[PDB]
């Protein structure tokens, strides 16, 4: 299809994966597991489950950002996720291994709930996918609900399990566009 | 060739280049999504070539680069178009209206997605025709 006789549309697609050594990238695989590459080896898993993995209502965050950064880049990524959520509670550990946090979606029926907040942030950092369990109306930015009660964010040992979607840099960059 | 991207930077593609007019236009024009991606590609390239170390992806370095290189509004507008069921672009693909004899490539436009699927040249017919007129005007 040539416009004005001579103009063709080429369509180029980017190797977003090429950026893995300088900036985090987000890819969704199946409907319960989504993740962030945090390099050419190490990753970060985001799981949608109904399992109470973390019962540590009191999270032992003392020295979390100071004495032992298992992965300082990773702790920074996890912290920005939290910080971009508007307004409430979380359970977590991060002592030794178990470098993870659990967000519980709990509500007694309106928009602007705690669940809506975590889901918006989650969706944005996993944007370009994450339409899964997108239980929301059109344009209703603050009415987004999901099917699962828990979101667990935890350290992984791999960079390569990407199918279904593409490891886009947009998610993390958007997360921090404050 | 302006900023040429190799087969290791483009997905399932060989190396691609374009005339310098387009890079000059990228640097002068504002709110073009592909320009932010180019800045990230060059940033990545240099960051590793200079670093030469396992101490990769320092978050503080990338955050500062992002503040310097990335337009936060392009990201937010695109996310709001998504919530509003308005076609929006992810950055995997771009449209490159290109003159086939001169190799004159326009600034890449992003390729909008509707209900999880790409829109046709039909949907972009107006944008395509307008860019073709602009390319002619600039060439003359």
């Amino acid at each position, epitope marked *: 299809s040539l416009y004005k006789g001579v103009y063709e549309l080429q369509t180029l697609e980017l190797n977003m994966e090429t950026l893995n050594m300088t900036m985090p990238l987000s890819c969704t695989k199946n409907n319960s597991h989504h993740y962030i590459m945090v390099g050419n080896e190490t990753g970060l898993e985001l799981t949608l489950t*109904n399992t109470s993995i973390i019962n540590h209502k009191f999270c032992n965050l003392s020295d979390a950002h100071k004495k032992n950064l298992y992965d300082h880049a990773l702790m920074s990524i996890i912290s920005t996720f939290h910080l971009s959520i508007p307004n409430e509670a979380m359970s977590c550990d991060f002592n030794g291994g178990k470098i993870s946090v659990q967000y519980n979606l709990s509500h007694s029926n309106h928009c602007g709930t705690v669940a809506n907040g975590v889901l918006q942030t989650f969706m944005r950092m996993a944007w370009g996918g994450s339409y899964i*369990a997108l*239980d929301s*109306g059109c344009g209703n930015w603050d009415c987004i609900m999901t099917s699962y009660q828990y979101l667990i964010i935890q350290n992984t040992t791999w960079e390569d399990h990407c199918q279904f979607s593409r490891p886009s840099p947009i998610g993390y960059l958007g997360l921090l566009s404050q | 060739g302006g900023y040429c991207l190799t087969r290791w930077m483009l997905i399932e593609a060989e190396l691609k280049c374009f005339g310098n007019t387009a890079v000059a236009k990228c640097n002068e024009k504002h709110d073009e999504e592909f320009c932010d991606m180019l800045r990230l590609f060059d940033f990545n390239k240099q960051a590793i070539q200079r670093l030469k170390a396992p101490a990769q992806m320092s978050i503080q370095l990338i955050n500062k680069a992002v503040n310097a290189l990335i337009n936060d509004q392009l990201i937010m507008k695109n996310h709001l178009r998504d919530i509003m*069921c308005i076609p929006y672009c992810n950055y995997s693909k771009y449209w490159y209206l290109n003159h086939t004899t001169t190799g004159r490539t326009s600034l890449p436009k992003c390729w909008l997605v509707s*209900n*999880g699927s790409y829109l046709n040249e039909t949907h972009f017919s107006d944008d395509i025709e307008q860019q073709a007129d602009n390319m002619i005007t600039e060439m003359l």
Partner: antibody
Amino acid sequence: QLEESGGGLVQTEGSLTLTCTASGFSFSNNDYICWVRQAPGKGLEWIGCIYSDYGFSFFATWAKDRFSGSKTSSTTVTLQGTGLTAADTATYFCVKTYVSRFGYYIRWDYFDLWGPGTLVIV
Amino acid sequence: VMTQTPSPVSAAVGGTVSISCQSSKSVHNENFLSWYQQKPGQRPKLLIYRASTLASGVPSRFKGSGSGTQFTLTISDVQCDDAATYYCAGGDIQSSDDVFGGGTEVV
């Protein structure tokens, strides 16, 4: 409950509008009205579905060529079919739904109340 | 697309009958589900839904389970009065128009 009307025999190369009426529970603007058919002796298939805030099509790839949209009053919903043929003979049913998930990616999960079926012969 | 256990199904009164369904693609969410039955001449009755929950007071005898693409149904202490054509439903709209099974006849 859900009550049916508008059934009976029609001629081929024709049209027929089927009707479902709300009883007790009036209709909201949500996707709470949905329709299916089955030829006698055959299993059930989807014809289309109904959302009341704005006219939505929701038709089966098959159904969409002969099945038009609907009127959605607070108690009465009307389904217009056109270009009907003998093969369209079936018992038709109005079902209340909480079935549709509403993000752009629409999903089918949990039908609830069924109306009596109505027999339509073409 | 959905498939189902063969149509010529029967059982003695008491005990169980084996009923099953399978999709071509995993369901959007494995906790989405609808099992129902139709006695001839009757409108459909929902039995089991979502994460194998019983609907509307139907007998506790109705059981089922599954995930992904494959789910099952069985009914304890089957009665002659449970004879019905048994069905599965659910699916994604983009994936299929058939969101109902064909039906298996259970005597």
